[PDB]
Paper text:
The eukaryotic La protein recognizes the 3′ poly(U) sequences of nascent RNA polymerase III transcripts to assist folding and maturation. Human La (hLa) is a 408 amino acid monomeric modular protein containing three structured domains: a La motif and two RNA recognition motifs (RRMs 1 and 2); these are followed by a largely unstructured C-terminal tail that possesses a short basic motif (SBM) and a nuclear localization signal (NLS). The LaNTD contains the La motif and RRM1, the domains required for high-affinity binding of 3′ oligo(U) RNA (Kenan, 1995; Goodier et al., 1997; Jacks et al., 2003; Alfano et al., 2004); indeed, it has been shown that the two domains must act synergistically to bind 3′ oligo(U) tails (Goodier et al., 1997; Ohndorf et al., 2001; Alfano et al., 2004; Dong et al., 2004). We have solved the crystal structures of four LaNTD:RNA complexes, each containing a different single-stranded RNA oligomer, and compared them to the structure of a previously published LaNTD:RNA complex containing partially duplex RNA.
To try to address this issue, we cocrystallized LaNTD with AUAUUUU to obtain a complex with an RNA having four uridylates at the 3′ end in the same C2 space group as the complex with AUAAUUU RNA which only has three 3′ uridylates. We found that the two heptameric RNA oligomers bind with essentially identical conformations. Thus, although AUAUUUU has four 3′ uridylates, it still adopts the tight turn observed for AUAAUUU so that U−3 is stacked on U−1. This finding suggests that the packing environment can have a considerable influence on the bound conformation. In spite of the variations associated with different packing environments, it is important to emphasize that for RNA sequences terminating in four uridylates, two distinct modes of RNA binding to LaNTD are possible, involving either U−1/U−3 or U−1/U−4 stacking interactions.
Author numbering: 6 to 192
The structure:
RNA sequence: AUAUUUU
């Protein structure tokens, strides 16, 4: 049972580390604004408004507990424990031609998921194919899931491996997997 | 409707 508490805390850490991570932060208008207010610090009162974290827990003490154990050590907790921020010692990487070129080469296109599949279904299916840093579910202008996604792996090596494996299926349904740039070339 | 939500 104590195991479940560890699991919840590992998920809380992962979710918050995603919001403040290299992939999401540079594209997060709302969050980039909060960060400019009090030297990076964002009150837990605000953090609780984040749906995904909300679903995990809205309790400040749990969140702080979870973060204080994080292995990533990306986040910093204030003394009064009412706010958190990305460590000033882990600044965002400079987005150079090279950085972007590397990102594109680590991005994959996958088609074949059912329209009702959720980010959680997809995340679970992916925890066995390499370290994923971002999952983008492709939706219509009105937010309807198209069944296709873009995935960004931790490195071009893990992405290459994944794209190389031919017999992949989701809940025993065939899947079309290509490198993201290759997908655009065809389309 | 910045009432932005993997905010």
């Amino acid at each position: 049972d104590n195991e479940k508490m560890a699991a919840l805390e590992a998920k809380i850490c992962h979710q918050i580390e995603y919001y403040f991570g290299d992939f999401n932060l540079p594209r997060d208008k709302f969050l980039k604004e909060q960060i400019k207010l009090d030297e990076g610090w964002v009150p837990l009162e605000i953090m609780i408004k984040f749906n995904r974290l909300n679903r995990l827990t809205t309790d400040f003490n749990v969140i702080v507990e979870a973060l204080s154990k994080s292995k990533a050590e990306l986040m910093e907790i204030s003394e009064d424990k009412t706010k958190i921020r990305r460590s000033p010692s882990k600044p965002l990487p400079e987005v150079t031609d090279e950085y972007k070129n590397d990102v594109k080469n680590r991005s994959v296109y996958i088609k074949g998921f059912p329209t009702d599949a959720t980010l959680d279904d997809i995340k679970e299916w992916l925890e066995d194919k390499g370290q994923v840093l971002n999952i983008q579910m492709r939706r219509t202008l009105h937010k309807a899931f198209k069944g296709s996604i873009f995935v960004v792996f931790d490195s071009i090596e893990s992405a290459k491996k994944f794209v190389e494996t031919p017999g992949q299926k989701y809940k025993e349904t065939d899947l079309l997997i290509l490198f993201k740039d290759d997908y655009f070339a065809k389309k």
